[PDB]
């Protein structure tokens, strides 16, 4: 009823006694020989259909009939009936078929894996990434600051910064070709960004030169060219674009205020952008920001939908095959308080008075605050001008983060369910949020007042990351240790539904247990392919 | 499917630290002074950074690997360019390898509950919280007494 | 008949039934339907041959299974389209229980 | 002429059973022995409390 | 007063494997195969994997 995600995750995890595991997770845990044993008939009798995942709920007096939701991909097959080595071999067969060019090597995958398990990852990168939150203009307010960040993190370790989010990847690979970083960091960044193009080429050659109607079979063969699948983090108003370009019917659950039309857009989405209508809207938006109705205010504000050349397929491939394989699904979306990260930097001594000149170090002038210890554990040395222009973006960043539950019907060939409630495939999308790698207690003691954890998606709900990020989930996994598999974590129901999700527990298991290589990425791409009729057509082609 | 994040030569360096007759007992002295307290660790950051630097320059060995808690404290605090980079990467190799072993042991017998408690404390020894560390610095005993 | 990918080759070399459990309804007791439906469809007990498992595949031998739907739910009347279906010999529950 | 697999899961009906996890019948078979062992070590049998 | 071997967890053969093995990855992975109980629950977990 109220769209404050922090009280949702806090009151879901506070002293939960029993941690119920679901049928899908118990299915994907055991291997293929223990599955067909008669000792697991309670899981064997709920597997009759390869495409439909049959369950049964609580008897409310109406016999508790079986409901069958669709496993939209091949990746959500039960892993005793489709082991991970089979998916690696199928990805290699697909790699031979479409003949994709691997432009990433082992070493960049090992480098992003080294960033992934880095408990010494500085939270100041997340601070500046929260200050950008997917804006080109905000990225070009602060070029020397982010350049100093990338250079310092590339000399102090073998690790690269800002690979936790797509917007940073695209903005550095576009903007920072001007040698303001090291050449090796830029080469690695464009290796990632060209690997995304190579995967887009592999998918466009998986099913091309066929048009089923007005539109091609690209949305009918795979989860990656399908526009009904959304990126997990959203920084623009992709819901309004979704409501237009979807031939099928999407409905966007925003705090019991669902809307499926673009005619109801201006009373839901507050289009912000390009620094100049805000140049008059400043005092009014700040006065709206200081009123505390936002937990029951049901309005969003985002940047405008830029017309990307690939229809957000790069973000999709990124967050869905790249990061959960090299990180082994060891991410978690964090909810960020944008007023607090501004109150750290702006309400501060040398950042306030203009006696302090632009090009001088700040660390001997920083008073005993949270940002002081943040830059001390980040070992980073900024000047006054870069942090001042960093603080200059407070008047456009949102009030909090939020979370929407984007629902969309499955397909025209996955709509054959008799029950009309199970013809839908919902997906949570973290609007205006931030996805992180992993923390330590030294970081978490600083950003206790700044960030908060969200067990958001199947790939971004790792209890290892939330456990060093959140307290209630830490004592929860202490009282129940078996939750540490990412397929068996009990996520909040207001932000995740394991029977309504696109990616169920088998893709989370394949993400966690795979070894980081190009063969694993080629296998994971062969999981984001539909079990549609047109997908069987295009698979019998190649 | 354990992912050995730690490397073979890390095992060789910690084995060579075990065999060094000139392993200084001053590291044992400062270990005895801190005895696993985080406030005592943040008291003595530059001293232990000097220890890690001097033991990484006078040999290839790494100091303070005699105790879990110093590995935990270096992985926590000393990742801000006060020690040498490659020694810190080896420390993170150790700390990540412990994480990988914990992950593997939980993936041994997980998603299978016998009651209030999972089966994990009965299938191995090291997920049983009744088994205790050899050295102790904090009150693990009343914690055991509550959780037993 | 759709099966999973972990169906072993050792099954498909022996003269088996195409579904998982070899429905040896001759091997059950005379004129009894509950124990024969237990042998055919109840997967809590292992089959006649491979006692270390229930079925070589779960998408054919179960009662609500996929191949059971596409072949058994059709009943071989006379005035149908009437293409010969070979799996009607091995999936028709009336024909299985007739033995 | 089938090719059956006796894995470890088929032996659980006999192995992990409380008859196979009690020492009482072994100690009854040992205390009833007329000729016990003659070495009878006493180095580290029990911990004496200081 | 400290070490009673017939009351302790780690007896002599585990220490023999500790002193006897060569320090590598396969030695560590073999050491965690030795911290498995011979409990019925562990027999279930080992017939699973």
């Amino acid at each position: 009823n109220h769209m404050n995600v922090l009280v949702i995750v806090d009151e879901f995890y506070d002293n939960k006694y029993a941690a119920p595991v679901t049928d899908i997770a118990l299915k994907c845990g055991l291997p293929t020989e223990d599955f067909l044993h008669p000792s697991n008939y309670d899981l064997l009798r709920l597997e009759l259909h390869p495409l439909y995942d049959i369950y049964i709920g609580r008897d409310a007096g109406e016999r508790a009939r079986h409901r069958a939701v669709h496993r939209l991909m091949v990746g959500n097959l039960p892993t005793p009936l489709a082991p991970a080595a089979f998916q690696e071999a199928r990805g290699q067969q697909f790699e031979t078929a479409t003949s994709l060019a691997h432009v990433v090597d082992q070493a960049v995958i090992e480098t992003v894996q080294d960033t992934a398990y880095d408990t010494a990852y500085p939270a100041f990168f997340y601070v500046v990434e929260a200050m950008i939150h997917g804006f080109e203009e905000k990225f070009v307010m602060n070029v020397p600051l982010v350049s100093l960040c990338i250079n310092t993190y590339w000399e102090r370790s073998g690790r690269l910064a800002f690979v936790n989010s797509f917007s940073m990847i695209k903005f550095i690979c576009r903007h920072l070709g001007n040698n303001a970083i090291s050449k090796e960091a830029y080469s690695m960044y464009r290796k990632i960004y060209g690997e995304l193009i190579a995967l887009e080429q592999a998918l466009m050659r998986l099913a091309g030169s066929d048009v089923v109607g007005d539109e091609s079979v690209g949305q009918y063969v795979c989860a990656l060219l399908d526009p009904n699948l959304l990126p997990p983090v959203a920084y623009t108003d992709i819901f309004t674009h979704l409501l237009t370009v979807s031939d099928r019917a999407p409905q966007i659950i925003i705090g019991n205020e669902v809307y499926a039309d673009t005619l109801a857009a201006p009373q839901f989405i507050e289009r912000v952008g390009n620094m100049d209508e805000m140049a008059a809207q400043f005092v009014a938006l700040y006065g709206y920001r200081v009123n505390g109705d936002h937990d029951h205010d049901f309005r969003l504000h985002l940047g405008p939908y830029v017309d990307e050349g690939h229809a957000d397929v790069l973000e999709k491939i990124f967050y869905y095959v790249f990061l959960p394989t090299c990180t082994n699904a060891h991410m978690c979306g964090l909810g960020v308080d944008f007023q607090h990260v501004a109150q750290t930097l702006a309400y501060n001594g040398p950042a306030f008075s203009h006696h302090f000149t632009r090009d001088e170090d700040i660390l001997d002038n920083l008073e005993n605050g949270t940002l002081r210890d943040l830059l001390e554990i980040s070992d980073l040395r900024p000047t006054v001008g870069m942090i001042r222009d960093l603080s200059a973006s407070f008047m456009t960043c949102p009030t909090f983060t939020r979370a929407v539950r984007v629902s969309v019907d499955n397909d025209v060939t996955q709509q054959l369910a008799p029950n009309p409630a199970d013809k839908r495939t919902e997906q949570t999308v973290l609007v205006n949020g931030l996805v992180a790698f992993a923390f330590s207690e030294r970081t978490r003691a600083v950003t206790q007042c700044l960030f908060h954890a969200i067990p958001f998606h199947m790939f971004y709900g790792d209890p290892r990351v939330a456990a060093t990020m959140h307290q209630d989930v830490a004592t929860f996994v202490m009282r129940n240790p078996q939750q540490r598999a990412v397929e068996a974590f009990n996520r909040p129901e207001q932000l995740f539904a394991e029977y309504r999700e696109w990616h169920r527990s088998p893709m989370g298991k394949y993400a966690a247990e795979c070894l980081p290589s190009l063969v694993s990425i080629s296998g994971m791409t062969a999981m984001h392919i539909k079990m549609s009729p047109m997908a069987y057509i295009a698979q019998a082609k190649l | 499917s354990l992912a050995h994040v730690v490397d073979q030569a890390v095992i060789e360096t910690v084995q060579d630290t075990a065999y060094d007759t000139a392993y200084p007992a001053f590291f044992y002295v400062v270990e005895a002074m801190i005895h696993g307290f985080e406030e005592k660790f943040v008291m003595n950051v530059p001293l232990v950074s000097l220890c890690i630097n001097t033991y990484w320059e006078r040999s290839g060995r790494l100091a303070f690997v005699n105790s879990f808690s110093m590995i935990k404290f270096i992985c926590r605090h000393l990742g801000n360019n006060a020690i040498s980079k490659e020694a810190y990467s080896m420390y993170r190799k150790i700390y990540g390898e412990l994480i990988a072993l914990e992950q593997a042991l939980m993936r041994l017998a997980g998603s299978d509950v016998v009651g209030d408690e999972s089966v994990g404390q009965y299938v191995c020894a090291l997920l049983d919280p009744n088994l205790l560390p050899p050295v102790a610095y904090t009150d693990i005993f009343t914690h055991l007494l509550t959780v037993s | 008949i759709v099966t999973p990918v972990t169906a072993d080759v050792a099954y498909f070399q022996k003269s088996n039934s195409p579904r998982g459990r070899a429905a040896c309804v001759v091997s059950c007791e005379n004129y009894n339907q509950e124990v024969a439906e237990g042998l055919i469809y109840d997967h809590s007990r292992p089959d006649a041959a491979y006692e270390y498992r229930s079925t070589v595949n779960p998408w054919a031998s179960q009662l609500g299974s996929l191949g059971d739907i596409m072949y058994n739910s059709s009943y071989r009347q006379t005035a149908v389209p009437g293409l010969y279906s070979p799996c009607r010999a091995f999936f028709n529950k009336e024909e299985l229980l007739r033995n | 002429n089938l090719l059956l697999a006796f894995n470890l899961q088929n032996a659980l009906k006999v192995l992990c059973h409380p008859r196979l996890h009690t020492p009482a019948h072994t100690l009854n078979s040992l205390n009833a022995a007329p000729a016990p062992r003659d070495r009878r070590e006493t180095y580290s049998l029990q911990h004496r409390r200081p | 007063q400290l070490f009673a071997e017939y009351r302790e967890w780690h007896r002599s053969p585990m220490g023999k494997y500790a002193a006897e093995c060569l320090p590598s990855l396969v030695s560590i992975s073999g050491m965690t195969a030795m911290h498995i109980k011979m409990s019925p629950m562990a027999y279930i977990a080992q017939a699973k994997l």
Partner: peptide
Amino acid sequence: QQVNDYIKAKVGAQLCHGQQATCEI
């Protein structure tokens, strides 16, 4: 009791062919 019936559920605790040979361990 819980570990006792948990084990009895994870094993075949409480036939159609040939009076099968009784294996032993």
